[PDB]
Design a protein around this ligand. Structure first.
Ligand SMILES: Nc1ncnc2c1ncn2[C@@H]1O[C@H](COP(=O)(O)OP(=O)(O)OP(=O)(O)O)[C@@H](O)[C@H]1O
Ligand SMILES: Nc1ncnc2c1ncn2[C@@H]1O[C@H](COP(=O)(O)OP(=O)(O)OP(=O)(O)O)[C@@H](O)[C@H]1O
Ligand SMILES: Nc1ncnc2c1ncn2[C@@H]1O[C@H](COP(=O)(O)OP(=O)(O)OP(=O)(O)O)[C@@H](O)[C@H]1O
Ligand SMILES: Nc1ncnc2c1ncn2[C@@H]1O[C@H](COP(=O)(O)OP(=O)(O)OP(=O)(O)O)[C@@H](O)[C@H]1O
Ligand SMILES: Nc1ncnc2c1ncn2[C@@H]1O[C@H](COP(=O)(O)OP(=O)(O)OP(=O)(O)O)[C@@H](O)[C@H]1O
Ligand SMILES: Nc1ncnc2c1ncn2[C@@H]1O[C@H](COP(=O)(O)OP(=O)(O)OP(=O)(O)O)[C@@H](O)[C@H]1O
Ligand SMILES: [Mg+2]
Ligand SMILES: [Mg+2]
Ligand SMILES: [Mg+2]
Ligand SMILES: [Mg+2]
Ligand SMILES: [Mg+2]
Ligand SMILES: [Mg+2]
Lengths: 239, 263, 250, 264, 250, 244
């Protein structure tokens, strides 16, 4: 039952005392943070929102507001992922070196503010995952707590827009980020502007490509003014 | 009158029954009944029963079983053999009634053995439909479900696969699986509301009209996929899913007459 | 041989016949036969005949009638009752021979009654019913292939002819399905309505209570604005379900 | 009767007249009259007149002048100011008639000054007021007889594109101006330039209401934004697409085509 | 500083007022106010008022009345005749203000007649209200949008009208006279279009023209309804039914 | 000037030349020229030459050979190797110049060897070759009018362009990369899109379509994607700007 799973989560937090919660602003880390606040109190919880080049300022700013809005003391940290050459040169194992810096930075903060653990929200401790929370358990328990506000856009590292072996730069990331942001603003929340030097190759879910046709000309000019020479749509669609 | 009066009628009927067996489909209506029964009578006085059958997907049974447990109910699966009844097997126009009889015979048998005073279902405006007795309309169901914190249920209206077949066509495991696989494939492309109507060698696909503009990119893949499942011709119904429900005043009048001409 | 030798062969055969009846479909081949008959024998000595029937559209008929007039021929329409022949009515693979037999029988009656020496059709080189009725395919006898037809038509200044290939409506019904006046009309009215929307190439395949519409796949995107009207229009023609074949044309 | 008799009637009427002024639009009908007039009376006895005006495109006028020259006729262009008549300028339901009145008046003036015996048009009361002669109609030509004789005469060049007075883009009672006429003409030309040869930009003050064949509306969506901006820069505040399309109800099922005709 | 400090300011202002009349729209803000008013003053000391009018739909009124009941408040509906004010009727750029003037006038009449010490609305930190002395307690306690959601969550509030309504006058050009008939026809058109799956829509009124505003991303799927939408809005009184090429809020 | 006047100028020039070799593409312009030459000089005094090459399609070549015979000309096929020239093969902005040199050079050899007085092509208004339509001031509208008057109706209506334009400047043309682009465009034309470019970007194909056609193309996305991948592209894409 959900009530049995919440007790597992309630009990696990009680044993840990002071915690540092890795907070993404999504529904999962939102549930963890609110449950931590409810059982341990605001003086014993630290919300950490990681800012970095591989994810959007909109997600960072949204998460920072939501943690404060949920009543947690919130702290920002900036990771410089591109200082790592594996990330900078986008190898197939970049993902690994990024996570190392992420968890290292939160492990440093937790040891430095007296936390007993770093917590995350995977379906470090994933107490939701240890308590056998499914996606549906997350929804019911959050509604029960009166939670309705969280970032519903699933973010993924911008390195996925670049081929392996391509050097990431500050300029490349900003160009892809602005292009994807413009496209979401047209009504397409799921999109990728895959970077191929002078070509942008846009990925949309195949079910959305018919609706996109009204925007062809505007997207072409906009992504050209961001620096692409050719703006194209992948016939295979998203993934 | 207000929702609170409708809720109070519901609480009162539940307490009077003491022990209930709740037929739980996973839709929003039976969820509210199940939630209310647990809350007023307690978990030891409620048995959630989910009927699994050949006419419905294992996906709906599994989803329903998990939701009943997640709400804190003891839930037991039971399997009905609808195709053992000749009216159902040959899909007569009253097949629905013998299916419902076989359904309710099974839940009354379960109720007698677990000491329940009644079988509850989620019918709204031998079994008891407390939502209907308390004058719940569809909007009342949604308001109390929101008030109660209920957010998980199957939001796609489930329907017996017999409706995909003409009256008089014999249902088989082969033709049922053929219809379900076609519907599962179409859902897997992003069309959660769809019907693959069976007409022997013709597949007639029904979509919400608002989605048919999106579908064209899949024409060739759906054609070839449904052919390998056994159809010779794969077609899209021009009237779409629930023809006439979206139409202007004159053409809903016209399509309703067309729909009555084949009564 | 040269186009000129083939043209000369055709001219001499026409001269020998003096008076002719041309089976005129409006297509390029009988257009060439008809124009040549006119040029060699004169308008007074040529009767152009367009057959109207239940298995083909009135639009194809009226178009041929106007085209023959435009070439300067006296044209007469005749009606065939193909469904009175049970071999046609029962839609077997050999129905088309009995259709052509009835067709050539009517043209021989017309030719006999106006004193023509032959019935002419536009068969070209690369048919039993034609020879058994004694009709002449002078383009085929003169070794005209399709490019010879185009070459002589260009030389004659012919530029207007019916470019739409006609097909008997019986292809809308599966083999063994009985043709009736009502089910033929139902398919014809349906296809005529769909063409009127801007789809000149279309098929309404008959499957009793199901209409299965075939469109060129490149046109299906345009069709969506018409879904509801086509659905209701074809139900009012008697179908229970109106469907679009996901496979497209043929 | 027979085609040969209809041609003879036409030839004789031409001979009885001896000198004519032929109203030449460039269409097939006035092309046939002009060719027959030349053949019977000779170029010195035929004057081709092409009327230019604000209610039609410059392309069609220039096209007609060249076509008459191609037939070997002495041709005169004349310009009409239809907007000087208040019925035309204020677009009343009878505006068309006063347009023809001004048209036939100007051609009669030309014919009287060059010594023609009649004005000829290619029609198959403004003519009975002016004295205009429709010799094809007096000889009972139908449309196919016009086609037969044009082919028989070896005519192959004429304007096959249907022209329509731009006054039809304006509601009755709306004042035509040089500006709003040019505004409508510029809009339709832009839409034709995108690949839409059958189109109307109906004028509704600050609104443009575009009529397209419905089979084209799906492809048109790729141009929405460019059309919106282009027609706004021509002076419309709102650029809209008629949901009923070009010639509403002509492509509707029987029930809803009679309900669309009832509403109108 | 903190939500708690802001909540405290609001609670004290509520206590100081003892008895209040709450202007309840059904939205999140006035939902927060009404819940705070009920929790602090008790159900006998708060009157929830939902304004019904021609410039808004019966559906939003029915939702707000029902929502106020769900919160456990005594709620009373009142009807405003916005069209009685000629500034509103002739839709000048100042129509909005004369509407709010009439609104706050009616709420003061109710509050004075039930013995309330103030009318409360749900204005937050982010006009004709101050020209009536109505109190925006969330605004005085410096509630921003995040504070409203933060406190609503803490109070267990999850149910409110999430669809922001908009006065139907925005469908009419400045200088256009609003009538009972043209308001109702614009409202029925938008309702019919919402019923097709377009919750964000505008039917702009231009006498005999309806100019429909849709999000551009929806227009590809909308084509399947063109003819039905065309005939439906003509049956409502439009002579022409059109789609704005610029989309929603062009 | 009237069409009859320009045609008369054309007739006189042809008579003046007596014997000509006509560079025949199958398009409307060279079709008009070829027909006028045949009509004025007779089949014995006209040689139609159709150039086959690696930069233009075998289909357009076969169509012209058929069209020349149908027009009543003795027609000769000749094969050019544009790629044997390094300027062409290395695809610079000067490639066109060497291509035209090689083209007119081969036609001059043919014309000199059969005794023609000139090579004729179909240039219209707006080298060692005569463009009689341009000298007689034919515009596109005059070409069509005279073509109709002559009863000409059959010609290749899709405007041809050297395949080298599918590759960026500085990209070396190969037999393989050309064939890959030629197969991709042929597949696309076979679906009903006679105007298309498959622009080559190594592992990316960038398809250009007339924008008016892009709405209908969507029913083909997956098949074009799969087909152009088996031809060797990794990503198959559509240019949002459309054709040209
Ligand atoms: N900027 C970030 N800052 C802090 N924590 C993060 C951040 N991004 C990801 N995480 C942490 O890592 C966990 C898993 O990350 P991820 O976003 O990939 O999965 P998720 O399903 O979206 O979880 P969530 O719903 O919490 O966002 C989050 O629950 C969260 O604890
Ligand atoms: N497989 C099933 N297993 C158990 N109970 C079922 C099942 N299907 C239907 N029911 C029960 O019988 C009632 C009838 O459900 P039905 O599908 O006919 O309408 P419904 O609106 O979908 O109901 P609901 O919202 O409760 O799912 C359900 O409310 C539920 O109580
Ligand atoms: N409705 C018809 N009316 C008169 N003759 C017809 C008709 N249909 C076919 N024919 C005659 O029979 C001949 C064969 O017609 P068929 O359609 O099988 O071949 P075709 O290639 O289309 O020839 P064509 O170019 O003349 O149309 C025609 O050339 C014509 O002479
Ligand atoms: N600009 C114009 N200039 C001179 N005459 C004109 C002009 N427009 C129309 N006409 C003349 O008035 C007659 C009627 O023209 P109308 O457009 O009404 O019919 P039509 O069927 O198109 O005739 P046509 O084939 O000659 O174009 C024409 O036949 C022609 O004689
Ligand atoms: N029909 C109405 N009846 C009663 N009060 C209303 C009504 N409409 C608006 N209001 C009141 O006026 C205040 C502001 O109105 P408005 O809708 O413009 O802003 P809002 O930000 O949407 O507020 P809310 O979230 O409460 O709906 C509302 O918070 C509410 O107190
Ligand atoms: N494969 C080719 N073979 C023979 N001649 C050619 C060929 N391609 C071009 N030409 C000749 O050179 C001239 C210029 O051709 P080009 O394609 O560049 O322009 P064009 O407008 O298409 O002319 P056309 O209508 O005749 O094809 C042609 O008219 C023709 O005379
Ligand atoms: Mg997340
Ligand atoms: Mg259900
Ligand atoms: Mg034929
Ligand atoms: Mg005309
Ligand atoms: Mg609101
Ligand atoms: Mg060419």
């Amino acid at each position: 039952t959900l009530a049995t799973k919440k007790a597992t989560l309630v009990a696990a937090l009680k044993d840990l005392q002071r915690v540092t919660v890795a907070f993404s602003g999504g529904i999962d880390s939102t549930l963890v943070l609110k449950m931590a606040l409810d059982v341990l109190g605001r003086d014993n919880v630290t919300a950490v929102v990681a800012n970095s080049e591989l994810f959007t300022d909109e997600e960072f700013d949204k998460a920072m507001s939501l943690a404060e809005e949920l009543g947690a003391n919130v702290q920002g940290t900036t990771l410089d992922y591109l200082s790592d050459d594996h990330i900078k040169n986008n190898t197939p194992d970049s993902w690994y070196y990024a996570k190392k810096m992420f968890y290292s930075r939160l492990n440093d903060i937790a040891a430095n503010n007296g936390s007993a653990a770093v917590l995350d929200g995977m379906i470090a401790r994933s107490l939701l995952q240890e308590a056998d929370f499914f996606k549906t358990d997350v929804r019911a328990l959050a509604q029960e707590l009166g939670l309705t506000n969280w970032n519903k856009v699933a973010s993924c590292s911008v390195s996925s827009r670049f081929p392996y072996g391509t050097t990431l730069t500050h300029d490349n990331i900003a160009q892809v980020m602005a292009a994807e942001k413009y496209l979401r603003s047209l009504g397409f929340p799921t999109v990728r502007v895959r970077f191929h030097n002078d070509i942008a190759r846009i990925e949309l879910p195949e079910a959305r490509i018919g609706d996109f046709l009204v925007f062809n000309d505007r997207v072409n000019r906009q992504l050209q003014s961001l620096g692409f020479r050719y703006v194209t749509l992948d016939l295979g669609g998203f993934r």
